[model samples]
Target: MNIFEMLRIDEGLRLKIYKDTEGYYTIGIGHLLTKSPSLNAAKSELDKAIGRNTNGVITKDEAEKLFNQDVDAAVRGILRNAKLKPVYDSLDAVRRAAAINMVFQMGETGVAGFTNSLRMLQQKRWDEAAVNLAKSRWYNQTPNRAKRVITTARTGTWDAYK
Candidate 1:
């Protein structure tokens, strides 16, 4: 699976509103409108994208639009991160996708918390990077996903995900 497909599998799409693990008001493939700086600005886009402000349900195409936008933001967040950006560039495609997925799940700032892990990644020490990542609370919260992603990071290959 590609980055988008893997993320869709991890986040799981919903047409209706729901709270994320962090309890933010999220919808359509982990898009947290609450995290948006201006709720009205985000809602205005959603209204046009979903074709109705009142309707609670959104079509798959509409959800795809939102999902893509969130992925775009995730990439931009990584690009904007001084600490993460260079390490991101060092990764192979699989590890890069894992990093993007991680950033999508837990903002770039959260991923930036892994100071040593990013260092290890930049040094091409895949095993060390995965080891450091596995020690985090993220493993406690979601072991399977972390395990898979960490393994991908370790291998720098698509095997873990595919």
Candidate 2:
């Protein structure tokens, strides 16, 4: 995937700090905590990366580099699910981005649990797949993101949220 499209799928053009699933501090498009960095080492790396002394905050360029490294691994993880390959391959860019984003949020195994939705996607029933997606607990947990993903999958548009 191109950097631009991967960036859109990664974080939707925003840089924010948050906790990941395992409760570690994550910043800028899902950069996870690293044990090697001990606190001081992390600060040093941050300083080297962004020319800043702050423990938190990262520049867009830095985030982009981190995302570039992560996205490829994430895509490979998604591809490990043979069931998803054909459907993922047949989708247009926007729909593909939605699938990648889902894989990022919920591991390939987790996403594979959406049996009905995946079936609809495999059948190229975009609308039905979107509907099934919205019916999940995932939608209840993150309605806005789910809406954007569903809209993108259904309409094949990039800026579905906007």
Candidate 3:
């Protein structure tokens, strides 16, 4: 059974879950981002704040801080080869880690931006996969966080200083 299946949500619901996952990282949680405690509420709030919907919950203004200015460009970059579709297709916990890592490093745009990397992952090229995964780390922007996550995921250890 897929991990998403374990979570008991269908594909549509999974999309919402992924959106909320990304939102929580980008926007954090609580009334600061959404006035409600539910994932749907936060998703609605973020969508509205981004001008995705006119009438809905209000996402915190700071949500934009997580994104770069050129959303369209980012889209072009990520979707140049439809990589996320495959990663999303896998739907395992590891893939979840990959997706979250992709999004956190690349944002909604950067997640899909590296088609070559995604292709490498889909091909199951473990060494190349690890390399591609490491490439996703924008260490200059995220400091050591992305690198730390990649290391942790790959090595099963989190002792960054060590």
The local distance difference test score of each candidate is 0.82, 0.70, 0.44
In angstroms, give how far residue 5 of model 3 lies from its true place.
Answer: 19
Top candidate, metric lDDT: 1
Supply every candidate's count of residue pairs whose N, Cα or C atoms clash at under 3 angstroms: 0, 0, 2
TM-score of each: 0.85, 0.71, 0.42
Per-residue lDDT over 20-71 for candidate 3, one digit per residue giving the tens place of the 0 to 100 score: 3234312422112443557667666657646676233333343333233333
Per-residue C-alpha lDDT of model 2 across residues 53-105, encoded as one tens digit per residue: 65666678878777776777668876777877777887777788788878876
Off by over 4 Å in 1: 35-51
- Which regions of candidate 2 fall more than 4 Å away from where they truly are? 1-17, 20-24, 34-59
lDDT of 1 by residue, 112-141 (tens): 998999899899987788889988999988
Instruction: Give the distance in Å from residue 132's predicted Cα in candidate 1 to where it truly belongs.
Output: 0.7
Q: Which wins on TM-score, candidate 2 or candidate 3? A: 2
lDDT of 3: 0.44
Worst 10-residue stretch by lDDT in candidate 3? 6-15
Candidate RMSDs in order = 3.3, 4.7, 11.3
Error of 2 at 83 (Å): 2.0
Model 1 reaches what TM-score against the true structure? Answer: 0.85
Candidate 3 C-alpha error for residue 155, in Å: 5.8
